[PDB]
Ligand binder design. Structure first.
Ligand SMILES: Nc1ncnc2c1ncn2[C@@H]1O[C@H](COP(=O)(O)OP(=O)(O)O)[C@@H](O)[C@H]1O
Ligand SMILES: Nc1ncnc2c1ncn2[C@@H]1O[C@H](COP(=O)(O)OP(=O)(O)O)[C@@H](O)[C@H]1O
Ligand SMILES: Nc1ncnc2c1ncn2[C@@H]1O[C@H](COP(=O)(O)OP(=O)(O)O)[C@@H](O)[C@H]1O
Ligand SMILES: [Mg+2]
Ligand SMILES: [Mg+2]
Ligand SMILES: [Mg+2]
Ligand SMILES: [Mg+2]
Lengths: 201, 526, 487, 479, 50
């Protein structure tokens, strides 16, 4: 792209992360969604590395096998019943979770960077949750439109339309890595000057 | 070169003239190296390896030579890849294609010397190939509705394929073996269903095709060594420590008697499984895995011959030969089919004992025993028989044939010449060059024989021009003869592939005008 | 390497691998250089390739011509910032002129003729031009099948390009289904099914196993026999669960056991083993089914319908592949490439990628201009006309831009074998005399200079990107005045 | 021959010599394969085949210089080979397996060229008896030489080689005190006499002090039960196969077995079980429940002997169920002598095997070669063209063997070959070189004969190798 | 050293990229860094003035 193609989004936008099988089977545009921000890992795993299971009978063995699926599905249903349509996490989202969300027309993203998640929270108005046992309305973020778009060979997630935003994001175009680096360096000089001028005029 | 450097140390660049020179030299060298092995009177090459502990082979196939030759010229690698792909596709014609490509590039070199743009040559060659393939298609002869004529054509094709190889000393003997082995498959193109076993000792005329089947395996101790009217069960299961219950379980007790009881139950499980196996009413059990000594003694007491460790290939071939199915879990004797044969015994070949199945039910697979005086001789014999089997399978899959001995090349050359005399511009020279390149294979064949190649090719060209579309070379005397009368036959797919691959490789090489080499990765001595 | 008559380059890798290619981006990527300016040109070509996907060599040619033209002005005593400003002005004027002569045509599934013509024009320069009609048709059909139209985007993960050496290039085709490099697990399974119902699974055909550390204690013969019975009961139960839903074919992401394999063979239901995640999601998207993690969750509403599943065998090798075809309306297609050489396959893949990118650009924006240098000649005329009204010493920079914008017709004519100055002089005289901006260089010698009649079509955004990117890169190069480096 | 490592061999066997050298020329790496092929097919004549091949390849040079083509040379060689096969088959003579004198003559002829020619009067009957003890002459068509086992034991002299119609073991007995048993009942074991052990991960947990003694008591009782069960059947000799995962015989088990007066032999190999069963009639047992009095074998004597200083050796003799097996003990005062004697005995066995395979006999001493040369020289004149030259060259390339024999014997080769040819051209076709008389005389009177299969195989393989060699015209070096 | 290039017009960035080891010269780098941290603009003017 060209320099005049640079843009400012009042909202947030970040790069696509790693995805498992089924990510292509869920919708990629929402108008009035609800956003859940989590710090919880949603996949089938051992409860604790400190744990150990000792059992005597095959019936109890089968019950133990079923218990893990029951736990994971309980967490997934607790997320689903809150009304959220977009789910973001700092921790890995498993293939089972991805297919579960895709089977009910909901969007999921995992391994989102901490800075991006904080900026998203500040833009939308939610709060990071480490437990899905108290997912009320006041902890869910809201945006006026969410999309995924192709930009110059990459895929980007856009949350736009929030009027109460306290942040913004720059998308800078150019022809080379050093071109973009020098553009960013030039933008920083103006940003600091404007901050100082806001302080004293 | 510009005073400024635009490359790392060791990186190299070659521009128009040098690049064309290098590519043409490499291609012509590759062609000239393999020209000598063409025709009924070609000779062999010795390949010995410096690195692989001095491995020695004597060969005639073109692809085998080109794979082992360690070329470094970029142009030669394209020809090597083309030959390898041709071998993987049809399995015959790996020398003619590279000779044709080399001759085409040799003509293109002089055409460039005459100040002609390469794109004009490319267009001329495109039109020439378009005409030649149509002529070849119109020349084909289609059989298959007649069994006798089909068998005659198969015999002719096999005898023509084996002419250039060492097996030409016993051509009829090996032609019959190839034809029968191919027709034992009942129309399936499964080439790995034919097992070739080669062993030292005896003359090459002692090779044969077995009427039953042959395994190089053993049988357990205290078991019958021969069976009449056998009922065979073919299984793929684990009869070793069979109690691999894939759970992560363990044993915890407070005594040694309990461990003894569990150890007894362990053997009881295997005894029950062996009884379930025997419930099918069999007298021969063939497993692909290992059979331990306790089930071995159970089978011995029951009076059953057990075969252990006959791998996937052997199990599949036994299934195709006898008619049974590969079974497991042994819980429904009414839903599993058993094999059948009239005799199982042991035979002594050389100094080896082999299990021999005679009077089989289906015969969908076969084994071929090769005897020779040298390991190189055995390797070359198997390598030559593979080409015959492949071409026979291909011509069975598509049953239309074209005459050989240069007749096809002269027909294509005549068509290209007739096209060339009809067009203006510089492209006519390109098509005439294409015709000249086509007319070189009979020349090399005659030269390798030691005849007057120029005079013979002139006579052939005159005959084809006047209208004898079946004339060709007679090698046993060195004259002009009729290919239909003499029985020189070939498959249409092989010739089509040769022509198309040669044209594609020639065009790909000719479109190049710049060679850029990066700094090589340094080997680490110490 | 510019034009339908251009030649190609042979690049030797660090390990001795050979690549014969005409793509400027790939050539510049495979070259290794020390000069920082050379690396900048490589990055410029790569950025053009990432953004548009075509015209990656014209941009570097234009940038080189522009930098060459700036040298005389540098020698005459002009500050390079003035040159950069004049270049910016001329580029803006040319871009403003470019969209005035563009014609919009169409995007729909009914006509497809202009799309075919555009794909033909983009494929005319490659080694594929022997079957370029066929491959253009393939490309346009695939993009129209996959494209999303209300949002105006396509996803290239829904198009799978695979090639196997052997056969003829003309054997290349399009499959509205899936093709994978697998086969049926048991050698005695049927090789074709014509009304396949597919159950897609992500669980191994093995008894279950908890993820956390566990130990099952066996303390008696009764417990031993209970475990022994449980193991086989699980194997039977999973097969009955799969069969009860009416499915006829099963696909699994992991391996089977011998017992499961024999039971699947015995119950007349073929299966496929050890497939990948992308293949599974493509199969689900094509057949309309869903991926299930357990046998307990399998229902007849989660199966997929396929009108044919076959196993295809190639020549004298043992290689076999699986094809799933004749589904209802599908959002996934595959391109099956064949050829006699590995480098042929690679170049075919690159050409097909170029065609798909061009058709995607047409989807994004549907107004075009005419190639053969006509747009460049018209832009040069416009810049030269505008420069006559600029008195402030920038007319020199504007005329330098106009001169450097005419290097494309020189390159085309010189490659085609005619005389550049006479050819473009006559063409420009004809253009200024008449009022046809659609006159260019007759490269193929068909007897006319009218590219609109000859059906030579190019996208507008490609030219805009070329001009803007080259101008900005030239400005960056001109701005630098010092360099430090070790020895 | 001294190797790179430092090992030393002394040999007369042609195949062994060629294998032990390291020839580098590719044309010289096919002669060793030819020798191996002749060794596999016949077991004798591994030198004459190489001599004949070299002679033919040498004769090809004059024709190549004169201008003949290699293809013509190959075809003419094939014609001459067919004629030679015809002539030799005509010269052959029928033989019956019930004639022991003929077998003795053949064995001593095959054996009188090695270092052990002085011990032929002791080694020939051993070989004949060994072959006749394994086959059934009524219908035997081939001989399995893996049914005869050769055991090499240092000490003594070659004179002490012997034939054993029983079982010989090189390992010692683990039982301290018992070394000789008469009227022995023998059993073979494929399970372990040790503490119980399951194939799954097992472990015993102790939480009270009584269990500590209980475990020991239970283990002791478990071992004692197996020992009593073994004793119940009347077994005197026990054989246990090798085991590497768990201990196959514990000290407690050995103590109980010694208390019950049973001789124990341990570490029987897993690959000679078939031979042991074939020899003594036993049946392998892999479960104690199947240890029954019908699964044992009976033998008259089973005892270990101590040689003077070399060590111990177990011998089992007088088997009630004698199989078709036999063994040979080879002695010697040096390892080089022992291996050379072993190779000589193998040569004799192979010659007898060939004579069983083909019931035909022929005279030795160069008679077949000289007759072949004369007949092919006569045959050449009937032909016209380059064929006559090629066939005459093939005929002349066969005097090399008689010339070599005369030169080795120290006579005049020219006069010897001339006299041989003249005598073969006027009648008797059994005349040959007599080394004892030092001249030319009837060779059957010296009782020197050989099978026909050796000559036929040598000629055929040599001709095929030469025809293969003529096909090559380029050498290239690969990776 | 690693071949990575940096194109810059910023005084503080240029001074950081230069490998200055003169004890008196290091002060001019220090003041440029201080100015950049404090106000964010004017990194060349202070060095020229000093
Ligand atoms: N008996 C024959 N008489 C005449 N031409 C023959 C004969 N046998 C084979 N050819 C010709 O030999 C050529 C094949 O070359 P060859 O070395 O046998 O195979 P390849 O293609 O593998 O090199 C073909 O042109 C074929 O027509
Ligand atoms: N048939 C044609 N007639 C005239 N010009 C053509 C024709 N086909 C392609 N061109 C021109 O060739 C130029 C170079 O295209 P190409 O060589 O494919 O590489 P790129 O598209 O990356 O520049 C294009 O600007 C186009 O206008
Ligand atoms: N006593 C003998 N007198 C004469 N010739 C003999 C006598 N014994 C053996 N020969 C001959 O000598 C040759 C035996 O040589 P030998 O060393 O056994 O070679 P090879 O191992 O190749 O058979 C044969 O020609 C054989 O007939
Ligand atoms: Mg061939
Ligand atoms: Mg292009
Ligand atoms: Mg001998
Ligand atoms: Mg400033």
């Amino acid at each position: 792209g060209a320099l005049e193609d640079s843009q400012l989004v009042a909202g947030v936008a970040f790069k696509k992360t790693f995805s498992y099988a089924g990510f292509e089977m869920q919708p990629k545009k929402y108008h009035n969604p609800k956003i859940a921000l989590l710090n919880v890992e949603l996949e089938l795993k051992a409860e604790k590395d400190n744990a150990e299971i000792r059992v005597h009978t095959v019936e109890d063995y089968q019950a133990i096998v079923d218990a893990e699926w029951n736990i994971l599905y309980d967490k997934l249903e607790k997320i689903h019943h809150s009304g959220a349509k977009v789910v973001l996490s700092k921790l890995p989202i498993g293939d089972v979770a991805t297919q579960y969300f895709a089977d009910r027309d909901m969007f999921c993203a995992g391994r989102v960077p901490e800075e991006d998640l904080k900026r998203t929270m500040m833009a939308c108005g939610g709060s990071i949750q480490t437990s899905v046992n108290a997912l009320s309305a006041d902890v869910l973020g809201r945006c006026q439109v969410f999309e995924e778009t192709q930009i110059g060979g990459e895929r980007y997630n856009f949350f736009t339309g929030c009027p109460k935003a306290k942040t913004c994001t720059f998308i800078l175009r150019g022809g080379a890595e050093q071109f973009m680096e020098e553009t960013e360096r030039s933008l920083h000089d103006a940003i600091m000057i404007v901050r100082r001028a806001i302080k004293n005029d | 070169l510009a005073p400024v450097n635009i490359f790392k140390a060791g990186a190299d660049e070659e521009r128009a003239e040098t690049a064309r020179l290098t590519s043409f030299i490499g291609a012509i060298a590759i062609g000239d190296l393999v020209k000598s092995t063409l025709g009924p009177k070609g000779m062999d090459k010795i390949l010995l390896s410096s690195g692989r502990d001095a491995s020695l082979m004597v060969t005639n196939d073109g692809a085998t030579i080109l794979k082992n030759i360690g070329v470094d010229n970029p142009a030669a690698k394209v020809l090597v890849d083309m030959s390898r792909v041709q071998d993987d596709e049809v399995g015959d014609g790996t020398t003619s294609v590279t000779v044709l490509a080399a001759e085409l590039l040799r003509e293109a070199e002089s055409l460039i010397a005459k100040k002609i743009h390469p794109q004009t040559i490319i267009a001329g060659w495109r039109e020439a190939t378009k005409a030649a393939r149509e002529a070849l298609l119109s020349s084909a002869v289609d059989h298959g509705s007649d069994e006798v004529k089909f068998r005659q054509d198969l015999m002719n094709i096999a005898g023509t394929t084996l002419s250039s190889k060492l097996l030409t000393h016993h051509k009829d003997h090996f032609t019959k073996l190839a034809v029968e082995a191919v027709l034992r498959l009942k129309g399936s193109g499964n080439l790995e269903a034919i097992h070739i076993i080669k062993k030292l000792g005896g003359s090459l005329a002692d090779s044969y095709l077995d009427e039953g089947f042959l395994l190089d395996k053993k049988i357990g101790v205290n078991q019958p060594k021969r069976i009449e009217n056998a009922k065979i069960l073919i299984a793929n299961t684990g009869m070793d420590t069979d109690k691999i219950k894939i759970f992560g379980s363990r044993v915890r007790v407070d005594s040694t008697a309990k461990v003894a009881e569990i150890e007894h139950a362990e053997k009881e499980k295997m005894k029950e499984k062996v009884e379930r196996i025997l419930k099918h009413g069999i007298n021969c059990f063939i497993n692909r895995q290992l059979i331990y000594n306790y089930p071995e003694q159970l089978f011995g007491a029951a009076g059953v011959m057990a075969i252990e460790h006959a791998d996937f290939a052997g199990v599949e071939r036994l299934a195709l030969v006898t008619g049974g199915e590969i079974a497991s879990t042994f819980d429904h004797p009414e839903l599993v089919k058993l094999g059948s044969c009239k005799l199982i015994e042991e035979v002594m070949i050389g100094e080896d004992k082999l299990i021999h199945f005679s009077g089989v039910a289906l015969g969908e697979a076969c084994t071929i025993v090769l005897r020779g005086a040298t390991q190189q001789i055995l390797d070359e014999a198997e390598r030559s028989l593979h080409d015959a089997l492949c071409v026979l399978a291909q011509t069975v899959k598509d049953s239309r044939t074209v005459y050989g001995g240069g007749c096809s090349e002269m027909l294509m050359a005549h068509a290209v010449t007739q096209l060339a005399n009809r067009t203006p511009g510089k492209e006519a020279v390109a098509m005439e060059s294409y015709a000249k390149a086509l007319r070189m294979l009979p020349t090399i064949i005659a030269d390798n024989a030691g005849y007057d190649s120029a005079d013979l090719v002139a006579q052939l060209r005159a005959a084809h021009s006047e209208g004898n579309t079946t004339a060709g070379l007679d090698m046993r005397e060195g004259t002009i003869g009729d290919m239909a009368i003499l029985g020189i036959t070939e498959s249409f797919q092989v010739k089509r592939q040769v022509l198309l691959s040669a044209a594609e490789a020639a065009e790909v090489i000719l479109r190049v005008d710049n060679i850029i080499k990066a700094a090589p990765r340094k080997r680490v001595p110490d | 390497s510019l034009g339908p008559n251009g030649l190609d380059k042979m690049m030797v890798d660090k390990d001795g691998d050979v690549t014969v290619t005409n793509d400027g981006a790939t050539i510049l990527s495979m070259m290794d250089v020390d000069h920082q300016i050379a690396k900048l040109m490589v990055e410029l070509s790569k950025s053009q390739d990432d953004e548009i996907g075509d015209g990656t060599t014209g941009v570097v040619v234009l940038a080189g011509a522009l930098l060459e033209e700036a040298e005389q002005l540098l020698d005459r005593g002009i500050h390079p910032i003035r040159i950069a400003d004049g270049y910016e002005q001329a580029a803006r004027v040319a871009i403003e002129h470019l969209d005035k002569i563009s014609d919009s045509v169409l995007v729909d599934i009914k006509d497809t003729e202009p799309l075919i013509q555009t794909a033909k024009t983009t494929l005319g320069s490659k080694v594929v031009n022997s079957c370029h009609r066929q491959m253009a048709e393939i490309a346009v059909n695939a993009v129209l099948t996959v494209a999303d139209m209300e949002r105006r985007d396509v996803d290239f993960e829904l198009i799978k390009v695979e090639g196997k050496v052997g056969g003829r290039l003309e054997d290349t085709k399009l499959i509205k289904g899936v093709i994978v490099d697998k086969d049926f697990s048991h050698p005695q399974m049927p090789k074709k099914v014509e009304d396949a119902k597919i159950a897609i699974l992500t669980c191994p055909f093995e008894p279950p196993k908890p993820k956390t550390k566990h130990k099952l204690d066996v303390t008696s013969v009764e417990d031993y026999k209970a475990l022994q019975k449980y193991e086989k009961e699980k194997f039977e139960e999973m097969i009955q669960q799969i069969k009860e839903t009416g499915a006829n074919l099963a696909i699994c992401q992991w391996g089977f056991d011998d017992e499961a394999n024999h039971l699947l063979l015995q119950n007349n239901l073929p299966a496929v083993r050890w497939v990948g995640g992308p293949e599974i999601e493509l199969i689900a998207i094509a057949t309309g089914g869903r991926i299930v993690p357990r046998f307990s969750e399998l229902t007849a509403e989660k199966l997929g319908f396929a009108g044919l599943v076959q196993e295809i065998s190639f020549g004298t090798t043992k290689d076999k592949m699986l094809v799933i075809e004749q589904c209802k309306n599908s959002r996934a297609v595959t391109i099956f490439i064949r050829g006699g050489n590995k480098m042929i396959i690679e170049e075919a893949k690159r050409s097909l990628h170029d065609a798909l990118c061009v058709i995607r650009n047409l989807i994004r924006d549907n107004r075009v201009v005419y190639g053969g240098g006509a747009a460049e000649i018209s832009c040069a005329l416009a810049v030269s006309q505008e420069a006559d009204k600029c008195p402030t010493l920038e007319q020199y920079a504007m005329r330098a831009f106009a001169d450097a914008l005419e290097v494309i017709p020189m390159a085309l004519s010189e490659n085609s074998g005619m005389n550049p100055i006479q050819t473009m002089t006559e063409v420009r005289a004809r253009q200024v005399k008449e009022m046809n901006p659609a006159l260019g260089i007759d490269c193929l010698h068909k007897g006319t200079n009218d590219m609109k009649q000859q059906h030579v079509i190019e996208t507008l955004i490609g030219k805009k990107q070329q001009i803007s990117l080259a101008t900005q890169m030239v400005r960056m190069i001109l701005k630098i005045d010092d360099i430090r480096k070790p020895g | 021959i001294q190797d790179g490592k430092g090992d030393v061999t002394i040999t007369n066997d042609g195949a062994t010599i060629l294998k032990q050298m390291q020839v580098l020329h590719p044309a010289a790496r096919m002669l060793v394969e030819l020798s191996k092929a002749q060794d596999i097919e016949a077991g004798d004549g591994t030198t004459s085949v190489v001599i004949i091949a070299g002679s033919l390849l040498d004769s090809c040079t004059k024709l190549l210089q004169k201008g003949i083509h290699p293809t013509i040379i190959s075809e003419s060689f094939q014609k001459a080979l067919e004629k030679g096969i015809e002539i030799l088959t005509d010269m052959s003579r029928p033989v019956e397996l019930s004639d022991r004198e003929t077998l003795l003559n053949s064995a001593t002829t095959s054996l009188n060229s090695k270092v052990v020619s002085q011990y032929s009067s002791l080694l020939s009957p051993m070989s004949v008896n060994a072959v006749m003890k394994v086959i059934d002459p009524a219908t035997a068509t081939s001989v399995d030489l893996r049914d005869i086992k050769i055991v090499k034991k240092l000490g003594g002299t070659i004179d002490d080689c012997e034939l054993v119609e029983g079982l010989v073991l090189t390992q010692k007995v683990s039982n301290s005190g018992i070394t000789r048993v008469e009227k022995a009942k023998i059993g073979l074991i494929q399970f372990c006499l040790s503490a119980p052990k399951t194939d799954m991960d097992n472990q015993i947990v102790v939480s009270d002090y009584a269990q500590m003694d209980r475990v020991l008591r239970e283990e002791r009782a478990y071992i004692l039960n197996l020992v009593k069960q073994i004793k119940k059947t009347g077994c005197n000799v026990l054989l246990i196969q090798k085991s590497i995962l768990r201990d196959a015989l514990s000290d407690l088990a050995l103590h109980f077995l010694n208390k019950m007066k049973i001789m124990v032999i341990k570490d029987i190999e897993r690959e000679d079980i078939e031979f042991i069963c074939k020899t003594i009639g036993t049946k392998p047992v892999a479960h104690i429940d199947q240890f029954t009095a019908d699964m044992l074998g009976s033998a008259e004597l089973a005892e270990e002997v101590n040689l003077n200083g070399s060590g111990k050796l177990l011998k089992i003799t007088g088997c009630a169920s004698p199989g078709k097996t036999v063994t040979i003990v080879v002695r010697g005062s040096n390892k080089l002598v022992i291996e050379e004697a072993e190779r000589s005995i193998h040569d004799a066995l192979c010659v007898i095997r060939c004579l069983v395979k083909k019931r035909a006999l022929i005279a030795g001493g160069g008679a077949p070669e000289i007759e072949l040369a004369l007949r092919l020289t006569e045959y050449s004149r009937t032909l016209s063209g380059m064929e006559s030259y090629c066939v005459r060259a093939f005929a002349d390339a066969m005097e090399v063997i008689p010339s070599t024999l005369a030169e080795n014997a120290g006579l005049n080769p020219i006069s010897t070959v001339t006299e041989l040819r003249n005598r073969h051209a006027q009648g008797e076709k059994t005349a040959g070189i007599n080394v004892r008389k030092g001249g030319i005389s009837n060779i059957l009177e010296e009782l020197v004969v050989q099978p026909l299969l050796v000559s036929v195989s040598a000629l055929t393989l040599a001709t095929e190798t030469v025809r293969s060699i003529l096909k090559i015209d380029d050498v290239v070096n690969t990776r | 050293g690693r071949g990575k290039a940096t194109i810059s017009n910023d005084g503080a960035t240029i001074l950081k990229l230069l490998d200055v080891v003169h004890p008196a010269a290091k002060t001019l780098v220090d003041i440029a860094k201080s100015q950049d941290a404090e106000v964010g603009d004017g990194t060349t003017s202070v060095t020229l003035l000093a």
